[PDB]
Every structure is written in C-alpha cells, then in structure tokens.
Amino acid sequence: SMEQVAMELRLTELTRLLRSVLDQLQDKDPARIFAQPVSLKEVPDYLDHIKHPMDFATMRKRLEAQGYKNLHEFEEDFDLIIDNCMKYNARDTVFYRAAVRLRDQGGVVLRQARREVDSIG
C-alpha cells in the first residue's frame, strides 16, 4: 500500500535524524569507553551485575536495521549505556566519570533532537 510506503519513509527519515544524533553523542566519548560491548571474556561476572548491556556499536546495528520506532526507544538505549556504567563502576573511576560527562553533554543534543522530531513530525 501507499500508506505503508509513507510510514516507511517516515521511519527512514527518523533513522537519518537518529544517525546524526548518534554521531553527535558518540563524539562526547572521545576516550571510546562506550564504543563496544563490555567483553564477557574480560569481565566474566558482568551479566550478574548488568541485566541489559548496551554500547554504541550495538545501537548502531539496531539503527541500521531501522530498529528504532521513535526517539524514546533510542533514548532508552543511550540511558542504558550511562546507567549501566554508573552502577558497575565506582564514583572515583575514569569509567563512571566518563559516563557523567556523556550524560551531561548528551542532554544538550537530545533536548534539540526532541524538538526536531516533534517539529518535522
């Protein structure tokens, strides 16, 4: 149907906007602390601590399959990256501090992304 095509173009345009948002958020992680999944070979107990691991490569895979239906879903995954790190790692660690900085700087980006998603539709 033509309706299904139009909805698919909307998903595509949302995907385009989320790709730009993702690139901007990942720039706020110049250390690349959040680039890849935590390795279970190197942190064997991780899944005892963290039930829903997340990282920017996993988000990029979901995005490229057009797996985010709305900005809320995308935000949920970004907040898992931050929140998981702030639970597993202590306040005095380079990891935790990296997450706080990503959260604060990412907030700016996400605030305008929300306006753009409402604005364009």
DSSP 27-57: HT-TT-TTSSPPPTTTSTTHHHH-SS---HH
Tell me the two tokens of residue 77. Answer: 């995954």
From the CB of residue 75, how many other CB atoms can be counted at a distance below 10 Å?
Answer: 16
Method by which the model was determined: X-ray
User: Under a CB-based contact definition with an 8 Å cutoff, are residues 53 and 38 in contact?
Assistant: yes
Residues 87 and 91: their CA atoms lie apart, in Å, by 9
Q: Which residue has the tokens 């005892």?
A: 48
Distance of CA 34 to the CA centre of its chain: 10
What's the rounded Cα separation, in Å, for the pair 89 and 13? 36
Contact 61, 74 (CB under 8 A): no
Resolution (Å) of this entry: 1.6
CA distance 19 to 70: 13
- DSSP letter at 119? H
In whole angstroms, give the CA distance from residue 22 to residue 88.
23
CA distance 62 to 56: 10
Domains, the chain, in order of start with CATH, read 1-121 (1.20.920.10)
Cβ proximity of 53 and 47 under 8 Å: yes
Provide the sign of the torsion angle of the four alpha carbons 84, 90, 91, 96, taken in this order.
negative
Q: Residue 75 — left, alpha, or beta (φ > 0 → left; ψ -120 to 50 → alpha)?
A: alpha
Cα(106)–Cα(112) distance, integer angstroms: 10
Q: Rounded CA gap, 12 and 68, in Å?
A: 10
Going by the DSSP 8-state scheme, the letter that residue 79 receives in this structure is: H
Residue 61 Ramachandran class (φ > 0 left, ψ -120 to 50 alpha, else beta): alpha
Residues 59, 63, 66, 72, CA torsion sign: positive
